[PDB]
């Protein structure tokens, strides 16, 4: 019966937000999670070992798979579901923080102060999804072609190499901006609707 | 002792099915991941190891793989699985939210609001189980031939590929096909019988 | 403390059952996953990476591979298990829906029914069962020969293929046999003693 | 506070056993099944991609795998294991059932039937026991020699094959050994404690 | 309800830090272990399988990997965060067994102590942090050439090896070496700021 | 709230042993466990299949690393910490099993018993682990050379055989001893405390 600490928690957390806007971002945290967990990482399980190029100098494969892929899709949506997930961790803590010492001042004696954090947080999540997108535009684009160039030392003038499945790659591509365009639209109606509240006072 | 309020919730979900809707949806829903969690992810493993073509070229294997799939069965089905499995959980959400804020409402004071949205999510699940159906059969088909023929650049004019053990494939696709057409059907008796209840007042 | 409910539960399931036959069909369900999570999956783990011809035709060995194993064993036991523990399930939903509904009604008021559908559910089993291994005996047999002949095109005339531990396999299908038949035998003896009380009125 | 009946239960199982054996048979069940969990089974994971033989028939490598060892020492011994812990599972849920009903009994009304189960079940442990070690003294002895000689079709009249790792598989065999002979000799000592103490009446 | 317990122990471990101090620790904490888990251990998957060199010679593929890296990043980094965790581990444990024996002597009887150990604890991580770092700063830098020469017996005069993937181990490297600085940091801060109120008396 | 009896067992084990032996066994014991779980099973993944000598001879490489590894560091060091971890095991189970029995002798009836265990137990980790650091002095040594020299049939004279990775393993052998010696240093001087306090009487 330990569960009614966890319901006030709960309560004064999501205190600002609306009520549609709660269960559309905790289901699509869920999605983006489990779809990361079980179908995404299991198609980037041989993206060294069947990537192979047109040539017969030694040590050729390695410099050209580097510079086809300065880094992997998959730790990069896992570093930018981390610093998604970051400052929501940081309100929360700071919010249990408060109500604890709250309580003992208040067992003890028998707006501006939490608004401010939520905004806060709720700018920086949209302000790390923009520049993540931006980032991933700015290196890779949003397709991936089955033949690449490759012209880098100690390799020969121009060799070809050919990727791993680059189609099944470009539909989990689309998929994770898919995502990612909702989640910043989601973000943005939670911050118009906030203050669109508060100029009315 | 911390299990009423979970029966409470379990009564106002599943207020309006059947008594025999209920049982089925949810064995066959443990039927369905446990199936996709044991016996169908290991067959296939080896989908791109065993590929093997009928020539010298280098580069040829990965871009007839590439046209043989454009995206695994078992993605595919993961993502109809979580696509059918979205708008309970967003029905599920809303409704316990719903009885916090009147619980609350009610500790204050001492149709037509919660049947709309559980007809839009048994809609929505027959919708995507439909499209999903439709796409597999659009894209691959319902079979698959041990002999593949292929006629992509930068291979010579038609070179023989052969798959990888798809007579189990085969198998386990008609599976998914009859399981995937039973959903449906009962998710279809479910909406005939909630609006053969509701025309008579 | 919240497990008498549980208890009332397992009263309600095994009201009809004999006080050898619980047990001993119990510890069965135990034994046959133990066993087949543990020792079985480990044995057909190259089932395919040592499957070797004796050939230079490039192709043979997928398509001779495929003639030989339709279907593993291990998805095949797997299949048969799920496909015999789905009507105790879907006895034990009925009855849980049951006994929230009954009690209900009578904290409102302050055979044939049940006995029915243990029959339904207590003849499927065996119907499966015996299904299961009447497939198996037409497809394998119940021993694996150390050289198979493979007539399979595009492969010349004749060629030896060789398989991959045959006898280890062929030990653990008997023993699934003799599970198989053990299960099959101790359900027939559930179904004869309900039948013989049942006829003394 | 749930758990004053499963101390009932701990000491309706354990009525007739010596204080001094119980300690040392669950310390050494606990032993068995983390030494086969964690050492054991990484040292037999290349038991066949590390087995060669000094010939150049294709398929010559399989059959003489398959003459050198007719079944894995690691599947063996969890089948042994396995068997070993039937019985007890088997007295423990007759002892459950027996308790219930008995508790049922005893709410309506406000030795040789349970010692003689005892007595198979710790007869059933020792003969399990002593069937598996001579099985295995019968089968492959108690070392492995590090060269292997092969007289099978279809290869040539004598050929070397040189195993994996002998050394190691015979140190973790001794120490197999030697647990089983303490298993043994405990159960024998129990029996005598329980059947010496019988005949004072 | 057995959870005040556990809050009085957490009360009386962070009696002396900032109330900004230990949210940030935490999330960092769980940020570093998040990290370390999950995107950083499969980029160091084939550290060696992929490690190709410019020669023939046999044997020397494994002195130029042995010459190249002494020890692997992910290990190095796995024992930095050992280390740093183990002085928290300390302070908890004395600080648990310290308030049992005290609430022994108060149920018996119906600065100095506490802070040294603290400031002991808030030492040592900040030492071990900044002898990790320089130990790193002095075997490897802070890069990863693509490029590596090998001088070492039984090679001959110089040859060319090429790494694997070294612009994704830059960028990690690159971002361990940022939450490093940023967690000795803010254990200097914690330190100034709790001898900044120690002056004061 | 069921944690006052655990409470009670953690009293009545720790009875005897200094309030300072206690916090750091415990954190050794959790140091020794991680360590061994996460960092240092993954530097002996290919301890065979990276091991390559200079010969053509086949069956050379098997026997070669047969004479190199009597048995591997990995499950020495499993074995070594299951054997000093069983007698704190053994003697939890007796002083539970006596707990037991004394409170229903005191339900009943509304120094040398438990010591001499204690010392016997704290005897036999010390004697364990000098006879495990004796064997592993004996047949190892503490470093490994690159280079190994290989003189046993069916190879040829005299063949130079290279090792895998052997820096990282000589500094992993260093902190297993220093963890070992550090274990052994604190147990001896639990048993001088308790011999100390046992002569003042």
């Not at 289901?27 to 990361?36: A, D, S, T, Y």
């Not at 072609?145 to 060799?159: E, M």
Request: some cysteine.
């Amino acid at each position: 019966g330990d569960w009614s600490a966890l319901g006030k928690l709960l309560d004064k957390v999501q205190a600002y937000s609306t009520a549609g806007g709660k269960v559309w971002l905790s289901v699509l945290f869920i999605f983006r999670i489990l779809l990361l967990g079980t179908a995404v990482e299991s198609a980037w399980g041989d993206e060294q070992s069947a990537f192979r190029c047109n040539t017969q100098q030694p040590g050729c494969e390695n410099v050209c798979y580097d510079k086809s892929f300065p880094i992997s899709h998959v730790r990069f949506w896992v570093l930018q579901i981390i610093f998604v997930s970051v400052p929501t961790l940081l309100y929360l803590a700071h919010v249990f923080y408060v109500m604890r010492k709250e309580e003992k001042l208040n067992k003890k004696e028998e707006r501006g102060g939490l608004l401010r954090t939520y905004i806060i947080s709720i700018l920086f999540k949209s302000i790390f999804e923009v520049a993540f997108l931006l980032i991933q535009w700015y290196i890779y684009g949003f397709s991936l072609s089955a033949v690449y160039t490759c012209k880098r030392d100690p390799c020969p003038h121009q060799v070809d190499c050919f990727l791993s499945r680059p189609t099944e790659k470009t539909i989990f591509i689309i998929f994770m901006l898919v995502v990612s365009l909702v989640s910043l639209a989601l973000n943005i109606i939670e911050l118009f609707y906030v203050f669109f509240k508060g100029v009315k006072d």
